[PDB]
Amino acid sequence: RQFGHLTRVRHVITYSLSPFEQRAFPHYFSKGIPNVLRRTRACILRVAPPFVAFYLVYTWGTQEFEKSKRKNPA
Amino acid sequence: GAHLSSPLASIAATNKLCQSFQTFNICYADTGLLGAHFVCDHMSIDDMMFVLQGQWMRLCTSATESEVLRGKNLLRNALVSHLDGTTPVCEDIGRSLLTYGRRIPLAEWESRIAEVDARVVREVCSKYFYDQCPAVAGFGPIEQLPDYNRIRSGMFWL
Amino acid sequence: LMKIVNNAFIDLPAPSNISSWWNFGSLLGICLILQILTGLFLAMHYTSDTTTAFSSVTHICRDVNYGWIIRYMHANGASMFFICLYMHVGRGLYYGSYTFLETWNIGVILLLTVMATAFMGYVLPWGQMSFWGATVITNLLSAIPYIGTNLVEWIWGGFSVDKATLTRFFAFHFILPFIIMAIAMVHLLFLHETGSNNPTGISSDVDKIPFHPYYTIKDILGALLLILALMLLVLFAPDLLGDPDNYTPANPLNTPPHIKPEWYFLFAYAILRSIPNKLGGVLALAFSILILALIPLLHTSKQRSMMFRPLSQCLFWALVADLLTLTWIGGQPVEHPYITIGQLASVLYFLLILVLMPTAGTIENKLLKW
Amino acid sequence: WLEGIRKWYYNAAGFNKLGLMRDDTIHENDDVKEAIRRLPENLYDDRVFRIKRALDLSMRQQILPKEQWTKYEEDKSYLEPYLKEVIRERKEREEWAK
Amino acid sequence: PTLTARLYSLLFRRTSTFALTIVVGALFFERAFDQGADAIYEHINEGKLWKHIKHKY
């Protein structure tokens, strides 16, 4: 497979520029970092909470393990 | 057909890659446009462009003197045969007096041409083709038309 | 003229919307070559005999001119291998690539090839975990009825691991990556009939582009970070992942208190360790892997991706936790606080795959009327 | 109450933040390739451009502004007539074989 | 012209030169980078290395 018989396009226009005629990293700090946040807010809720719970079962799993080795009053 | 001289033609006749193409040279006040126009079936664009770019690099690098005298002798039979009548003349006048200033008597063009040898071409084409930042246009089934980067990477031999 | 096949690798159509995730799909081409390249020079000095092997390792780590590196570019390199996989395998789940049914199944046989290779690769130097790590894993096949004792004796060349069982691996182990090197080419061939599979899930045929300028350098950039995050281990912390015991010579009359194979089994080792029964836990293990072949018969949503399925996102990364749990829970000994977690987590693994990920699309189809 | 949830899920899936519609994102199979072949030009090219820009913005990880987003009431189900037409023929083609 | 443009038309234009440039710069670069790290490494570990205890014995 290759270019030439993939599929159909009609009445679409493309505007593209050389790289030499433009900076490589325009608005890297300005527009990116707000876009990092918006990128972040849209994933954080359904990514962490499992890993959040993991921090607790890595927490309680060791604490409850430590106690079991300490003697009892008997 | 195949027996033509310009390699770009004999190939396109041999392999039937295209249907028509022409070069040009447009010239404006302190700049111009140098390049070409070509028309071909969608399954053959990328092949033509490699050949075209192959020739420019060939001319900027290895311009055989025997191939120069052709184009010199071709050009003479343009300006002359162009000036077979009055209307072509009166264009060249009315266009000369706003572009160059003085009209140029044709024995002046001829002297300028005979200065041209294969050493000059390798300098000129180096200045205006090699590694430059071309401009590209497209209108049609161009599914095979390569990206701008691939065009420029194909601009310099080696 | 055969160069024209590298239309596949030069003028190939591929999308433009592509993340840096798919670099991981390419690094294995580097890791596979990088590992063999290292391991080859490495194995110019290894010896397939017991009495000299552990010395024949230290013959490298001490006396050879920069031979000490090659052990660790190889070893930890074998771990950066997996770190790409378990981001590369989790990918197609999260972007719906398993639909390429002819390809995903190949993605299994590469894995099982490795998880029986890398195993052989840990046991060569007789690190006192080599031996028992060879014993614990290999003995499980004895669980089978009427053939278990026969095969394991047959692969033990006798009755337990010994000089013969070393050498039966060093040849089985120095060969298979080539079988991976070949099957990898197959893994790309079935792809080339369809090309990649965007994050969206949509046929981006309208927006396919070349490969020589764009994804090449991106892959190099991907490769550059790999070497970086591989030089750090070897240069600054080679003792990190590999358990320390592997520098002790091996002795069948002395076990360590705690045993674990290398860290990467642990998502799967723990599953067996949860089940107190012997056999019935094994078939969970092999099913803990081959389940990936069972997924494409469980693609419910008439969408493909999970970028556009926020509910399944909540369940996908959830699975990553359970793995990151089972990766660790197996790494710790057998005591009451943890066993209660393995009985849950291992069930959660099978549960999230076979019940709820279908159930999401069964719903999400209905929230949007198809 | 239900319908307050469909409108919400459709906002959380993301694919209104990319100028897309619902039929755009469907898994492509033989059943669907039939329908996309059967569409008219005016609507077909209108499918293409919705995709062709969403890709370029899933490249950048950028989106459209809030105004140009898609709206649930405007989530036109342009494909459903052409699709269910097919699977009618499919099950007519199968049960006729039994 | 800037240094950059003066640098382009001399070296980075003709590919035959562009490869000649790199080995040259690399050949000298090997001579500096080693001296740098070997001294920084010496400096940070001052009073620890063999060459620092090479006179006593």
Ligand code: HEM
């Ligand atoms: C995916 C392929 C492979 C994996 C996963 C793998 C696994 C391993 C591992 C984990 C070690 C750790 C030993 C240590 O750190 O001390 C090792 C060592 C070794 N590898 Fe492999 N290996 C692979 C392929 C190879 C190849 C391709 C070669 C040779 C070309 C090779 C030859 C050796 C030898 C001789 C040793 C002993 C050195 C040692 O134990 O440190 N292996 N291998």
Ligand code: HEM
């Ligand atoms: C040495 C082992 C492997 C090599 C060399 C390899 C190589 C590749 C490469 C180069 C790609 C294209 C890059 C990409 O699509 O992201 C790819 C894609 C893929 N690989 Fe791997 N792979 C290996 C192991 C695996 C494994 C273990 C799986 C497990 C399922 C797998 C499943 C896939 C799938 C499903 C794709 C689909 C591509 C797409 O969705 O566009 N591969 N593989």
Ligand SMILES: Cc1nc(CO)c(-c2ccc(Oc3cccc(OC(F)(F)F)c3)cc2)c(O)c1Cl
């Ligand atoms: C989309 C996409 N497609 C392809 C191939 O279709 C590739 C791709 C490109 C080149 C490839 O060639 C290689 C390079 C090094 C090792 C390698 O292993 C080997 F050789 F099979 F062992 C294959 C292999 C895969 C890719 O990196 C991406 Cl991102």
